[PDB]
Structure 1
Amino acid sequence: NWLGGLSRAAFPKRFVFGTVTSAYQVEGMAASGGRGPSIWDAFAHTPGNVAGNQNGDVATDQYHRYKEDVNLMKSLNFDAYRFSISWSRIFPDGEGRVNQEGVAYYNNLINYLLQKGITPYVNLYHYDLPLALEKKYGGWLNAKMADLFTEYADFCFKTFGNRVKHWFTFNQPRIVALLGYDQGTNPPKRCTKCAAGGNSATEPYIVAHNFLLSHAAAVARYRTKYQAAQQGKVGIVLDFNWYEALSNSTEDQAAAQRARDFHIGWYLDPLINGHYPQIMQDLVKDRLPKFTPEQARLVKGSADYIGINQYTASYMKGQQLMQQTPTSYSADWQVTYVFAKNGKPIGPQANSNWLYIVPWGMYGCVNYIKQKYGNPTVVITENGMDQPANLSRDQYLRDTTRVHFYRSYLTQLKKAIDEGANVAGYFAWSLLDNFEWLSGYTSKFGIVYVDFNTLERHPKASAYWFRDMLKH
């Protein structure tokens, strides 16, 4: 059977199933409804930055169609919806004046979700820093972001927290640090060689540090001011792709572990244990900021659950650790990516070149967090795969590779849960085909097809697979 034995009965009682979008990727109305620009508006409007010079001005127009989309997710038997609030839709300048029209949109969305029995899981931030804050403060390079983010978070808790009980602060701070400040391919386009300036060996670490301090400050505000009345929870969303040693050699096993530490440990060791991973301290040395004891105690325990975005896996080959002149966060790992093992690729690729279909990576990541970090509460906050551009409607809808992807990855998640992993929920990226950052509209991640000419929605086979799997 096409469900492969999966159903709600195959997962723990009260396990949460949802779909995911983010504000810039789906809302549209980017320069309307009072919204101020984000760093992604400026970036996407610059020729050459995004495939086809496309942008999120209109995107899927969820802003005007949200009741259609909520009706659809309910019809597909989902329990929850993960979405984000655009900071610059609430505060066009990032601080100061509130855009009441923006507040009204999120109130309307939240209220309709609840009316339809869908639980809102709300991200405060999903790459979309208000442009005014980048220009005035230097964005995530500035420790003042903790104060600025906390004041924004405070407003959201006050305004929506009587209804919203499941929050996340950030989405994939590793990717902001890596692409924004190491490689310089996402805004603010900083790197050692970059026109905008930068330093690939130092800035990624400063940025990650400020995300951690900002998360901790916002959670301290929630706990001290809002939690007693509202009785909700706040977590953070981290990307984790699996790393598997190429061989059982000491050197290859060490490489795979180094990669895990530089990838997920970078955030999880602070959040769970109150310190950066030892290997990062040892290799990055004075380029890695030091938490004061007080800061470390604020960061430790500051996530009520850990959101993991899980997509893929890589083989890692080792090498003798060397003394080297620092060049970048990426080079600091001292690991060697390799394509294959025993003559076989790790898996076939989806449309995105980085996305190898490797269902056992889901088990790898979840089991690893269980065993290393004291089995914290984890929510799989994204998992999915993409189709290419230029297909026909019918070709998009017959998404048999995505059906197989979800069946296989969910079977591997189930394996980890059955072995005792404390996973509370699972969210598919994405509800809808949408604006996929540098790929623009050339990458289709949705379980629902969006025609970008007419904006019509059409559920794909994978949407009906979920409807069947999730029937109550």
Structure 2
Amino acid sequence: NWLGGLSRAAFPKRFVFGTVTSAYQVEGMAASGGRGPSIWDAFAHTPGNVAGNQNGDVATDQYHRYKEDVNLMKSLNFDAYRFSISWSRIFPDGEGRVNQEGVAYYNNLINYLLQKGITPYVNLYHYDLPLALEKKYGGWLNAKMADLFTEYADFCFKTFGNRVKHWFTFNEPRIVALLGYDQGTNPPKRCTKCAAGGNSATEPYIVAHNFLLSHAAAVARYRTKYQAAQQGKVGIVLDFNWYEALSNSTEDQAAAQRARDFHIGWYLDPLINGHYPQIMQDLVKDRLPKFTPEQARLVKGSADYIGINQYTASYMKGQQLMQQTPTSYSADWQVTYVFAKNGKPIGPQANSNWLYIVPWGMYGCVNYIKQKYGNPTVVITGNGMDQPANLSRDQYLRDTTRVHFYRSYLTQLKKAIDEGANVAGYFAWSLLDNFEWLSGYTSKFGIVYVDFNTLERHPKASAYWFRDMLKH
């Protein structure tokens, strides 16, 4: 059976199925409707930064077409929709004046979702820091971000929280730290060798610390001011790809564990246990900021659920841990990536070079969180794969590899849940082909095809797969 035995009956009662987008990747109207620029607007408008010098000015134009898109997700039998609010659409300068037209958009979207029986899961932040805050404060390098983000979050809670009961603060802070401050390939393009300045050995850690403190501050505000009346929940979205020891050697097993700790433990040990992973403390030393006892107590337990974006897996090979001059967050792990074992690749690649199709990584990640962190409530907040550029419409629609991807990965998730993992929901990245950051429109992650000339939507085979799988 093309469903491979999957259906709602194969998952827990009340298990939530949804699709996901982010504001800059789908909304369009980037410089309209009162929206102020984000760091991604400036970045994308700079020649050479994005494939084909493309940007999110129009994207999928969900801003105008959101009722079409909500109708479509309802027709595909989804229960929920994860989307983000653009900070600079609400506060064009990141602070101060409210853009009422932007508020009205999200009200209209939220209300239509609810009208159609689709639960809104709302991210406050998805890489799109208001440009004014980058320039004025230095963005996530500045501890003042906790105050600035908390005030923004407060507004969103007050304005939308009578209707929105499922929030996330951040999306993949590890990726902001890594690409924005270690490698310097994403905004603000900081790194040791970078024109904008930076230090790949220190700044990723400062940035991660400020994300954790800002998350904790925003949640403290929710709990003290809004929770009694609104009775919702606030979590965070973290990326986690699996690491598997290349062999059963002590060294390789240690390397895979170090990778897990530097990847997910960086955020989860603070959120669950109130401290950074021991290995990071041991290796990063004075470059890793230290939580005060008060801050640690604020961060610990501050996520009502853990959003995990899960895509892929890698083999890890070890080495003797050495004393080394610090160079970068990436180099701090002291591991070696390997994508074959016993002469066989870990899996075939999707369009994105980093995305190896490895369904057992889903089981790996979910089981690991279950066993290591006391089985916290987890929501899979993003999982999917991409097709390349330049295919015909019909080639996009016949997305047999993506159908296989979802069947296999969801089978592996089901395996983990059946073994007792506390997973509450699953969200497919993405509802729509969209603006895929540095790849621009050359990477197609949607279950729904978007023609970027006409903006027409066409469900792909994988959309119909979900429709069949999710029928009530």
- Shorter-chain TM-score category? over 0.9
In 2, Cα distance between equivalents of 1:147 and 1:19: 31
Residue 449 of structure 1 corresponds to which residue in structure 2? 449
Residue 324 of structure 2 corresponds to which residue in structure 1? 324
In 2, Cα distance between equivalents of 1:109 and 1:251: 51
Cα offset, 1:322, TM superposition = 0.1
Instruction: Report Cα offsets for 1:30-75 as digits up to 9, x if no partner.
Output: 0000000000000000000000000000000000000000000000
Residue 281 of structure 1 corresponds to which residue in structure 2? 281
In 1, Cα distance between equivalents of 2:373 and 2:150: 27
Cα offset, 1:22, TM superposition = 0.1
Instruction: Give TM-score scaled by structure 1 length.
Output: 1.00
In 2, Cα distance between equivalents of 1:69 and 1:324: 52
The secondary structure found in structure 1 opposite 2:83 is strand
Cα offset, 1:15, TM superposition = 0.1
In 2, Cα distance between equivalents of 1:323 and 1:21: 43
Instruction: Report Cα offsets for 1:409-439 as digits up to 9, x if no partner.
Output: 0000000000000000000000000000000
The secondary structure found in structure 2 opposite 1:40 is helix
Instruction: Report Cα offsets for 1:443-465 as digits up to 9, x if no partner.
Output: 00000000000000000000000
Instruction: Report Cα offsets for 1:379-404 as digits up to 9, x if no partner.
Output: 00000000000000000000000000
Cα offset, 1:270, TM superposition = 0.1
In 1, Cα distance between equivalents of 2:407 and 2:339: 24
In 2, Cα distance between equivalents of 1:354 and 1:130: 28
Instruction: Report Cα offsets for 1:251-303 as digits up to 9, x if no partner.
Output: 00000000000000000000000000000000000000000000000000000
In 2, Cα distance between equivalents of 1:444 and 1:338: 26
The secondary structure found in structure 2 opposite 1:444 is coil
In 2, Cα distance between equivalents of 1:140 and 1:187: 11
Cα offset, 1:112, TM superposition = 0.1
Residue 263 of structure 1 corresponds to which residue in structure 2? 263
Cα offset, 1:79, TM superposition = 0.1
Cα offset, 1:190, TM superposition = 0.1
Q: Percent identity?
A: 100
The secondary structure found in structure 2 opposite 1:167 is strand
Cα offset, 1:81, TM superposition = 0.1
In 2, Cα distance between equivalents of 1:347 and 1:400: 16
In 2, Cα distance between equivalents of 1:319 and 1:109: 51
In 2, Cα distance between equivalents of 1:64 and 1:230: 29
Cα offset, 1:2, TM superposition = 0.2
The secondary structure found in structure 2 opposite 1:276 is coil
Instruction: Report Cα offsets for 1:77-103 as digits up to 9, x if no partner.
Output: 000000000000000000000000000
In 2, Cα distance between equivalents of 1:165 and 1:337: 40
The root-mean-square deviation of aligned C-alpha atoms, in Å, is 0.1
In 1, Cα distance between equivalents of 2:330 and 2:367: 25
In 1, Cα distance between equivalents of 2:176 and 2:166: 23
In 2, Cα distance between equivalents of 1:339 and 1:293: 41
Cα offset, 1:184, TM superposition = 0.1
**How many pairs are equivalent?**
472
Instruction: Report Cα offsets for 1:165-205 as digits up to 9, x if no partner.
Output: 00000000000000000000000000000000000000000
Q: Which runs of 5+ in 2 are unaligned?
A: none
In 1, Cα distance between equivalents of 2:336 and 2:103: 47
Cα offset, 1:355, TM superposition = 0.1
Cα offset, 1:119, TM superposition = 0.0
User: Runs in 1 of length 4+ with deviation above 2 angstroms?
Assistant: none
Residue 44 of structure 2 corresponds to which residue in structure 1? 44
In 2, Cα distance between equivalents of 1:101 and 1:79: 28
Cα offset, 1:339, TM superposition = 1.9
In 2, Cα distance between equivalents of 1:400 and 1:342: 28
Alignment of 1:18-37 (within 5 A): 18-37=18-37
Cα offset, 1:162, TM superposition = 0.0
In 2, Cα distance between equivalents of 1:448 and 1:331: 38
The secondary structure found in structure 2 opposite 1:387 is coil
In 1, Cα distance between equivalents of 2:73 and 2:412: 24
The secondary structure found in structure 1 opposite 2:174 is helix
Cα offset, 1:132, TM superposition = 0.0
Cα offset, 1:323, TM superposition = 0.1
In 2, Cα distance between equivalents of 1:270 and 1:28: 35
In 1, Cα distance between equivalents of 2:89 and 2:409: 35
In 2, Cα distance between equivalents of 1:336 and 1:243: 11
Cα offset, 1:363, TM superposition = 0.0
In 2, Cα distance between equivalents of 1:21 and 1:281: 35
In 2, Cα distance between equivalents of 1:114 and 1:339: 44
Instruction: Report Cα offsets for 1:351-410 as digits up to 9, x if no partner.
Output: 000000000000000000000000000000000000000000000000000000000000
The secondary structure found in structure 2 opposite 1:464 is helix
In 2, Cα distance between equivalents of 1:112 and 1:412: 33
In 2, Cα distance between equivalents of 1:155 and 1:299: 21
In 2, Cα distance between equivalents of 1:379 and 1:5: 22
Instruction: Report Cα offsets for 1:195-227 as digits up to 9, x if no partner.
Output: 000000000000000000000000000000000
In 1, Cα distance between equivalents of 2:387 and 2:81: 22
The secondary structure found in structure 2 opposite 1:388 is coil
In 2, Cα distance between equivalents of 1:59 and 1:92: 19
Cα offset, 1:113, TM superposition = 0.1
Give yes or no for the alignment of 1:343 onto 2:343. Answer: yes
In 1, Cα distance between equivalents of 2:51 and 2:111: 35
Alignment of 1:18-417 (within 5 A): 18-417=18-417
Cα offset, 1:27, TM superposition = 0.1
In 2, Cα distance between equivalents of 1:118 and 1:338: 41
Cα offset, 1:18, TM superposition = 0.0
In 2, Cα distance between equivalents of 1:33 and 1:348: 43
In 1, Cα distance between equivalents of 2:287 and 2:116: 49
